[PDB]
Every structure is written in structure tokens, then in C-alpha cells.
Amino acid sequence: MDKNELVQKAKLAEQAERYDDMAACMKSVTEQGAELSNEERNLLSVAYKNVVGARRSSWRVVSSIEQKTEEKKQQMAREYREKIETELRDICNDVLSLLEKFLIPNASQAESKVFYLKMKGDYYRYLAEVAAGDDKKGIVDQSQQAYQEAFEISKKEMQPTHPIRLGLALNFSVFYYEILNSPEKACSLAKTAFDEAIAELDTLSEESYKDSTLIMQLLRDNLTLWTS
Amino acid sequence: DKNELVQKAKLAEQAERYDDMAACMKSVTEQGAELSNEERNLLSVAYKNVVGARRSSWRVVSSIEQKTEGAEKKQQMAREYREKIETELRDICNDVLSLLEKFLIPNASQAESKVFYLKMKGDYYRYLAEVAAGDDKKGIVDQSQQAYQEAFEISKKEMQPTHPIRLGLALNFSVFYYEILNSPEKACSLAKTAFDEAIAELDTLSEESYKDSTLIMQLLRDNLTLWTS
Amino acid sequence: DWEIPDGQITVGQRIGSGSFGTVYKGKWHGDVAVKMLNVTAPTPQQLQAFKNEVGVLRKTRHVNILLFMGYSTKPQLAIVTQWCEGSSLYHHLHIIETKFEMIKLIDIARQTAQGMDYLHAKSIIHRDLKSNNIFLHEDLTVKIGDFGLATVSGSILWMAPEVIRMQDKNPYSFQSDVYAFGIVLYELMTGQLPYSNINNRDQIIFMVGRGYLSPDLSKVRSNCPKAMKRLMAECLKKKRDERPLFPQILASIELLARSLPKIHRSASEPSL
Amino acid sequence: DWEIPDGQITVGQRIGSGSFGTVYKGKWHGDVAVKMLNVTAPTPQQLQAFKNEVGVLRKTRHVNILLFMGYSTKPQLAIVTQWCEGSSLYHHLHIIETKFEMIKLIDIARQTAQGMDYLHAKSIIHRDLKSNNIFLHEDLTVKIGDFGLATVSGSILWMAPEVIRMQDKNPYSFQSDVYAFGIVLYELMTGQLPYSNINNRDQIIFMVGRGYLSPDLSKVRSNCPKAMKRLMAECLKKKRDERPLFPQILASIELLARSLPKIHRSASEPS
Ligand SMILES: CN(C)CCOc1ccc(-c2nc(-c3ccc4c(c3)CC/C4=N/O)c(-c3ccncc3)[nH]2)cc1
Ligand SMILES: CN(C)CCOc1ccc(-c2nc(-c3ccc4c(c3)CC/C4=N/O)c(-c3ccncc3)[nH]2)cc1
């Protein structure tokens, strides 16, 4: 099971909707010291995002039931909910741990650095979306510079029609409104990201236009809802 | 307790976490008490969903293997992963089957209860039948039809031909012949008729039975059109 | 002339009742809908109403108006119209209570407001608006039926106070439909039947007829925009001469439709 | 009386050219489509054709027929209908090269045959059937528009030999209408413009008249059922009286719709 063989196994798991086996294999691939290429980066991103997405949605629907029933039905929902964060925390902690030992320390190219930092800050945000109490203040504090450090790296050596920078700006804006509750700052930085995108349509090639414009409309969709 | 586990499984239904739902409902059967209609459905949906994901996972990977010929290494690597799905489908099918043979059928009291679990036993044998191969393949095909024939005989004597449970038995039984034994003539013969007697007694059909039956009735007609061509 | 020779209009499964007839799922140049009273040798005055009903439907040509295909005299008095895949909005809010979408709720609201705007252009008054007439054609288009009582009593929830008072020969007016439309907008946004607190009919006529009872906007769902909430209050006013006419209603609905937000409150989703 | 007063209709983006003029996306009680000649001082005989066009569209009321809303006299002789958002059948098959499922192909074929039965039931002949005239409202329903040359030359790909050989002053017959439907049926199932390997016009007009030209059935998709192949051949017959009328074609398609494998895998328990 070398680098090439392990990558193929993830692809079959991707086609078979076996996300758990996809993440388990892809975690081993990045734990060998090799420098991941562009396509392996998408496979790792797809693997760990989908597994969290199902658990995130499970908590979101369960949390709706818990706070909309007012005995014994409240404790059983809380007990079931407490199991959700447990599964969510270790899967998020696993990604955070693996990023800081193998990916970021060996991250040579800056565009690869900004991807991992963008991906890194999300898992603090996912925990921030559910962690309540004194731990919430600490966990959001660590996420703020990860978004900030990634944003400034793309601010200089990376194009603003690039999907990743545009995706980072979309991912950077959502943090303030959904966690920090600062719509004034979120929309302001979303506008300049939107304004920097609209001013350089004469540079994108015939490959990256599709993903960039898909993220481009998502910025508009949030902005209209935010301005309400 | 009793109510707590019912609520726990119902809570897991809205969260799209069927693995937890199946585990909670498994202990409800082991309690030994009779299961009401609303909790029998929870048993069916929880176990159907968990095995349905494995069924699709095996189906997709099997199609890939046959379409990637020429390179033996790619063919080789798909076999053990298929066997991982093969065995994972086996434990879940064996889990319900062992549960069926030990706590559901023996404790059944009503005639409708007996046929319902008999249909499930044939269904979960059919799921393993569609995936297993070799000498043991025909054995589990053999036991599956015995559960079906026992279910079919009991169903006709007691339930009305417009009863959705009987319709589901006939629909599942018809697919068993075409997909597994490859006998469309016998499969269509029961499928063609089973539609008719339910049609022949639409006068006694209740409003509550109008909704659920017509989905099964149309699927029987839908299945008949595919097998006819 | 739109006379159809008899025998062509077959009669299928019964669906329900209409103004003064019973509807059927017929077959005449395709799937159609036919409503007949199944009473042979009808009264002459009902024929006059039946004759006047055709004279009104023959003057309606719109997408948001149920398409009048023709009328049959023999063997029984009936009209043949379009068949809407699905059911009325009443069935979608009182039988299945569909969890509707706000972006769709405005679109269905805009289509209805567009339907009566065309009617009022031809100086046509419907006088029989209710949620049982909002036919949701395969969940995209909306048609307006029940043109028997209309001209160029009702259901105890969908009239304006002026007509409950039993005023002069023509108590229904252009604004009377607006209040009825406003009652319709109440059901879409709340998702609940208005006047649900009172389960009687003798009490409801006295309290709303004289103006002592008006719908309350407490049950409207939270994510409903403030602009839509203001419009509902602006159209349910007690006096007719101050209600906003349909041309203003369409502009207000379309104005907030552009500014209406979407769902999935946050994106954060690259394709990958 | 649908004579709209002047100034009640706006004009939007130019959509295209219809029978005797250009069509515009208007705004009159919602989005509409208005057809006008945009020519001042209308020709005296041009008004004769225009009044009949309104006088024939006023007799059609069907879900599968384009809905005529009204007509205008001043400042222009214009006719306005409903707006079928989406595109036309020509755009789907020859511009975008779209692909539909087997159930969808019959659905379009059944509906355009469904509406045409209504037209011939009122003794009305369309005379200009063509894939530009099959408008797909909301991508599902099919509407029959462009009644410019109706009764009670444009492209020749969709007309009949019975109107090519310069027959009596009434060559437009019911069977001639049926033939144009058959060519449409060729367009649907084969998914290709008829006579793809011919790139001229003067040869086509003479060859169809003498009976030496007919679309080749080699381009038909293999998944197309044999029932349509018989119907296509019986509808493409050169002679007039040997072509079935629409009601039998309409009933033939409905028979095929039931015997069609909608699903590709055997259906199990819906649960
Ligand atoms: C729920 N409760 C009200 C009990 C009762 O339920 C009913 C449910 C549904 C209905 C129902 N009336 C119509 C209806 C109404 C008016 C007219 C027609 C049909 C044909 C001619 C006409 N002129 O106004 C339809 C319908 C119309 C078009 N396409 C499909 C259906 N459907 C009537 C009653
Ligand atoms: C030639 N160049 C412009 C390229 C593009 O070609 C065309 C593109 C599009 C078209 C086109 N004509 C119509 C059309 C045809 C007939 C009639 C009307 C519109 C209004 C009333 C009428 N009487 O015949 C439509 C259309 C109709 C309804 N809904 C949507 C569209 N679309 C015609 C030509």
C-alpha cells in the first residue's frame, strides 16, 4: 500500500459513498511524510468535510427538538446530544492534530499553505458552533488568526479570481456573523472581496471560471440575507 | 425502560443516524414484550436503512470492478473492499435474522404479526441471496422462499387482499423470482393476478388505506411493465 | 360559439363539489375537469346562472385563470375546463399542511394577485375568493376557478365586513376581493386557518360582520419579512374606500420579492 | 372582444421572427409574448391575413395550444399571447443538442399530438408544423403556437409533397397536416435534423414532389420502441389517403406510454 495505491482506494470509497473508509485511508496517506499534490488535497478535503457535515446536521436538528419542548424528554435529548459532540470533537480534533504535524510543517508552497490554514480554521469553527461555556472563548480565539494568517498570505501572492481566495473570503466572512456576531465587519470584508472579484474578470482562464463563479454567487446569497 | 427506548429511537430518526436507531430498537425486541404497530415500523425502517446503504455500496463497487478490466491490480484491489462490504452486509443481515429467529417470530401472537416477521426473514435472506455465491447461495435462496411461502399462505387466509402488508409481501415475493431465480413467467403470474383481486375489492377499501396501498399497487404495475418488456 | 356535441365529454371519478354542482375528472381532448349538478330537468333560474357563468368564463384568457374549454348542455348541464395536476391550496394547508417555502410563498402570492389584476381589467368581479379556489397546478402555476357566483353566498371566513352587513344589491366591490385576498395572504403566511379560536358560525357572523373581530398577526412565522407583514395589515382595513387596489398589491409583492432572502443561512461551501 | 386599447402593452427584448413579423417579450398582466409587424401603413391585403389570424386563434382553448390573450390595432397591428418561459423544441434538439429520457420523448410526442386532435376537431388546419413551433412551457407542457398561416411559404423541410406539385387551390388537407407531425416524430426520436447529408434546397423541393425523397430510418435510436417505427412509416407515406388521422395516432401513442419501462431496476418495498 504505497502512495499511489492508497490514493486509488479513497477514490473507490468516494464513488461508493463510504466516507468513513475514505477518511480513514486518506488520513494514512497524509501520515507518510509525502508532499500532497493538488488532487490528493481535494480527496482529503472531501473526506473529512462530509463526515463532519452529517454529524453537524444531526446536532442541528437534535438541538432544535431539545429547546422546543417545555421532565424526562429534555434529559434524553441532552444525553443523546452530548453523544453527538463526542463523535464530533474527536473527528475534529483528529484533523486539527494531523494538520499541525505533517501538513503545515512541510507545507512548502504558499497556495498550499493557505488551503490548509483555511481548512484548519474551519474545524475550530465547527467546534465553536457547538462548544458552550468558557471553552468557547478559548476555541474561537485560536481560529481567528488561522483565518487572518491565511487571508493575508493570499492578499499578496495569490490572485483574487482564484477560487480558494474567494472561497476563503466566503469562509472568512461567515465566521464573524455565525460566531462573533459582527455583521458590520462581515459584510464590509465580503464587499471588498466581492469588489476585488468583479474588477478582474479579464484574467481567469477556461478552467477555474466554473468554481470561482459558483463561490461568487454564494457570496451574493449571504450578503442579501445578511442585509435584512 | 420501555418508553425511554421508544423515544430514544424516535429521536435518532430525525437525526439521520440510523446506526444508533437500530441499536436502540434491537434491545426493545430483546425485552420479550409484544411490539405495537408504531414500534414494528421503527424496527423495519431502522434496519432497512442501515442495510440499504451497504447494498448500494456493494452495488456501485461491483459495477466498477467489471468495467475496469485489463489491469489486474485495479481488479485485485476492488475484491477485498467488496469483501469488506460483503462481510459488513453479512453481520447486519445476520444480526436481524438471529433476532428474528429468537425473539420476534416465536413471541408473535396475531396472524398479521407472524406474516410480517416472516416477510422480513425472507427479505433479509434475499438481501444476502443477492450478494452471496457458491453452494451456500442456493441454500439461503431455499430458506428465503420457505419463509415467503409460509408468509404467503398465512396472508391469504386472514388479511384482506387490499391490506398493504399483503401487497408488500406479494411485491417483494415477485421481485425475488425475477432478480434471484430468473423466472419472470412465474414472477409475472403472481404479480399480474395480485393486482387484480385488490382491484376487485376496492369498494371495501378505506380512506386511510387509499394512500399507502396505491404506492405499492403502482409499484406492482411499474414492476410488471419492466418485466413484460 | 363553443357548443360541444354530446357524448364526447366522458365522466370519470368523482372529486368533489363546486358552486352549485359536482366536479368530475373527465376525458375530452385530454385530461379535463367537468362540473355538473347531476339534476335533470333543471330550474329555469339556475339555467340563467349557468348561462351567465359561461358569459364570464368566455371573457377570461390568462395563465393564472383556470382555462375554460367549453360547456355541455346535454345530458346534464356542465362546463369543461383545464385539469390541474394536484389539488387546491386548501388541500395543501388543511389536508396535508405542506411546509411551504418563503421564496415560494411569495411566488404563489404574486401569481394570485396577478390573476385578479387581469380580472379587474375586464371589469370582472369574482366575489368568491377562498383558499379552496387557489388551484396549485403541479406546484408551479396557480389558477382561479368557481366563476358561477361571479359576474361582470360564500364561506363564513372569506368575506369582507361590508357584504356580511347585507348592504345594497351590490355589496361586493373591487376592494371586497382585496380583503378576501388579504384573508388568503393570512393563510399562506401563518399556515393556519384564520379565526381558529371560534368554532361556531352564529358567533363569528355577529363579531366580524359589525367589525368587532379582526384577524391577529401573532401567529405569523418569525422569518416572514416585515414588509410583507405591513402589507397584510394594509389590506384588511375595515372600510372599502381605503384598501389598496390590486395594481398596488402586485408592485408591493414584487418589490419585496427581489429583496427576499434565501435559505441555507450561510454558505461556506466550495464545490471540491 | 379582445381588442386591447392602445398604450396598454409594453415591448421588451426582441425574441425573434415569427410568421409575418417579429415577436417581442411584452408586459401585460405578467410576462407575455406579442407579435407585431413593426411596419407603418400596413399593406391592404396584409390586414386581410391578420384579421383571420385573430379570427382563428379566438376559437382555440386548450392546455396544449398557445393561449391567445388579445390583439392591438394602434399604434401597430399586434397580437399578444402567453409567455412560455424556457425555449422551443428547435433550440432543444438543434441548437443546444439536449437529451431527454425515453418517457420524455413520448410525453412531448403525445402532447403535440394531443393538441392537434383538438385543432382538427374544430375543422382548423395549422399548415405550418415545425420544430420551431413546439414551445415547451415550464419545460414540461407543450404548446402549439404560430397560427399565422392557419385556416378553417417559409422552410420546406416540414411541408408535404401534396403542396409541392402545385395541386388544386386547396392542397392543404388534414393528411398534409398529419405528414408534418410525422417529420416532427422523426426529429424527436432520431435526435438529428432530417436529411443531414444534404446541404442544398433546390434539390430538396423537386425530389420530395416526385416521391424520390424520404427520411432514412437508420438514425433512429436503438432504444426507440418498434411501435413508433410502424407509426413513423405509416405517417411518412407518400400518398394522401393512406395516412392515419390524428385520433388513431393519438390513441397509438397512449398505448405505447403504458408499455414503457420507466424504471430500469426492479422496484422493491417503498417503506
Ligand atoms: C376539502 N373539502 C373542501 C372537501 C372538498 O374537496 C374538494 C377538493 C377539490 C375540489 C375541486 N374542484 C375543482 C373544480 C372547481 C371548479 C371548476 C372545476 C373543477 C371544473 C369547472 C369549474 N368551474 O369553476 C377542482 C379541480 C380543478 C381543476 N383541476 C383539478 C381539480 N378540484 C373540490 C372539492
Ligand atoms: C432568427 N433569430 C432571431 C434566432 C432566434 O430564432 C427565434 C427564436 C425564438 C422565436 C420565437 N417565436 C415565438 C413566438 C411564436 C409565435 C407567436 C409568438 C411568439 C407570440 C404570438 C405568436 N403568434 O404566432 C417564441 C416564443 C413564444 C412563446 N414563449 C416563448 C417564446 N419564440 C422565433 C425565432
Residue numbers in the entry:
A (entry chain D): 1 to 70, 73 to 230
B (entry chain C): 2 to 230
C (entry chain B): 449 to 600, 614 to 733
D (entry chain A): 449 to 600, 614 to 732
Give the published text.
To further investigate these issues, we isolated BRAF dimer complexes from mammalian cells treated with the type 1 BRAF inhibitor SB590885 and obtained a cryo-EM structure of full-length, inhibitor-bound BRAF2:14-3-32 at 3.9 Å resolution. It should be noted that despite the presence of MEK in the cryo-EM sample fraction, no density corresponding to MEK was observed in the 3D reconstructions. Additionally, the RBD and CRD as well as other regions of the N-terminal regulatory domain (residues 1-448) were also missing from the density map and are expected to be solvent-exposed and flexible. As expected, a 14-3-3 dimer was bound to each C-terminal pS729 site, forming a stabilizing bridge between the KD protomers. In our inhibitor-bound BRAF2:14-3-32 structure, interpretable density for both C-tails stops at residue 733, indicating that the C-tails (residues 734–766) are flexible after exiting the 14-3-3-binding pocket. In addition, density corresponding to the RAF inhibitor SB590885 was observed in both active sites and overlapped with the position of the C-tail segment in the ligand-free dimer structure. This finding shows that insertion of the C-tail into the active site can be overcome by inhibitor binding and is consistent with recent biochemical analyses of active BRAF2:14-3-32 complexes using differential scanning fluorimetry, microscale thermophoresis, and surface plasmon resonance approaches, which indicated that both ATP-binding sites are available for ligand binding even when the C-tail segment is present. Taken together, our findings add support to the model that the asymmetry between the KD and 14-3-3 dimers is not determined by C-tail insertion and that the active sites of both protomers may bind ATP simultaneously to promote catalysis.
